[PDB]
Symmetry: C2
Amino acid sequence: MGVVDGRVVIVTGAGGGIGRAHALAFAAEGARVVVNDIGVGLDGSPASGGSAAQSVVDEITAAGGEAVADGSNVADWDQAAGLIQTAVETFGGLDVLVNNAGIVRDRMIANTSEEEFDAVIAVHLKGHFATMRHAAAYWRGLSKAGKAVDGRIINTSSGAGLQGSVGQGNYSAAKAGIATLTLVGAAEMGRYGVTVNAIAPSARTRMTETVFAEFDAMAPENVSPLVVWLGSAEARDVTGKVFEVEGGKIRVAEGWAHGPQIDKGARWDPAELGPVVADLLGKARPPVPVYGA
Amino acid sequence: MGVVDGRVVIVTGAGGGIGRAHALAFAAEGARVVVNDIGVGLDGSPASGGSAAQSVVDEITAAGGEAVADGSNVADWDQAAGLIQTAVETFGGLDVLVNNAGIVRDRMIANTSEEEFDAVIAVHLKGHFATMRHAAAYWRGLSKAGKAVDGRIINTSSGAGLQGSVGQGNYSAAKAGIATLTLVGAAEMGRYGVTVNAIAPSARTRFDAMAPENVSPLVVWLGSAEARDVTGKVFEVEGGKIRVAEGWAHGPQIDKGARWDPAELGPVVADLLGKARPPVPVYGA
Ligand SMILES: [Cl-]
Ligand SMILES: [Cl-]
Ligand SMILES: [Cl-]
Ligand SMILES: [Cl-]
Ligand code: NA
């Protein structure tokens, strides 16, 4: 039997790249998949006939699995709600939400346009928040009604969100919001049987989506196995974790810690802080450097 | 001679609370201060006669300092650009940007409305990014022209951003974006003589340890000439306490050297988690 046999999984941005790899990986392990992607079909509507979402659905069905396309824009709060309903209406419920949809608009902070900031924040951080909001309310409602909940949220952060990435300020901020939102979700939703975790694919993992296809450590398919496992019944005791992944590597990211402290026990004179700050900083753990520095 | 004597500083949300404490603290150490606050004056427009901003400006002058009120909403991109320009047109330059403006609209994630998400993200994260973007484009300009730059950005993160805070997922996400933005800003802006740091005032911050005035001295120091070699840091502050927050670290790792089978990952993940450092808990959990 598959690792997620019978489970209903939504994957956002699943028309290509890593999201496509997750969709195929889940279906291969017995899940019924909602392939969510805004890419338009021949008629210019999201996820319709001729779309990337439908192409992935056809791959799944040709392999003997079950899937449906959905064109919700997760940055649109109401369409994110409708995405949860697509799963419930089509397949009878929802077990796993995989937040993957993203865009990049890479610029130095000093050269970032308003629209370039807004778009990256909206797709990544608002999109992840909106689906979490609506899926959690759904699962909480089942729990209130005495129903079975063993639900799973897997978010997509990045080393750029954890330690920063030069020339990717907007993207780094959004992925940082996603890492912390994962921590908070885990704390809030365990009450009604939902775990919340994140993966952070390496920057070298191949994440763009080319036309032609035919050990490659950087293949996006190498990221999905841990997502599928976290979406399984067996992963019920894992929550609030962030896993960095590439190829065959899995690394646990360890969160912000309390470093060196000093206490005056009174109000500091700003003039006296130089030696105080120098002392603290020499004693502090060296950080993981900003990516691209 | 003041610690920030002559330095031109912007404090956002400086009409009350910690933002007010910052403004007064900089002025006391000789800085010329732009008091930014959107609170309306008697005529109903932001930062006019009778406003919170102007009130604070009056406090500064009467102690013998120099300050100007500014009404810009930093969540509005164009107004953030104009806030930078106000500093430059009024005092001829900018040395320090203190991003402080903030709101809370607390809700569990499952109950958060779109407006509760959008407003919190806009004020904190967009507000912070907007001012950094415009201040950096300005400092970058001066530097590419061979002019003097010894600039400072001090952002306001929170333990909510670092470890999360229950019932405050919106706020936590915004503050996390600010923490990492501080790291990226520090890496990018050092090229043109600008340091970028953040403070995270403690939960209990409002000898009165919880008094907002206790947070300001480190911000004043960070904005000083002496602080030229401090960048990319996040300091947790309360009363007489200063603590360095230590960033995300590399924990245990395993490498199959081939693609994992999802069915085999149970013991693999169990092993990794057994070796991983226990986190600082989510606030409010
Ligand atoms: Cl992306
Ligand atoms: Cl650029
Ligand atoms: Cl609530
Ligand atoms: Cl503290
Ligand atoms: Na198998």
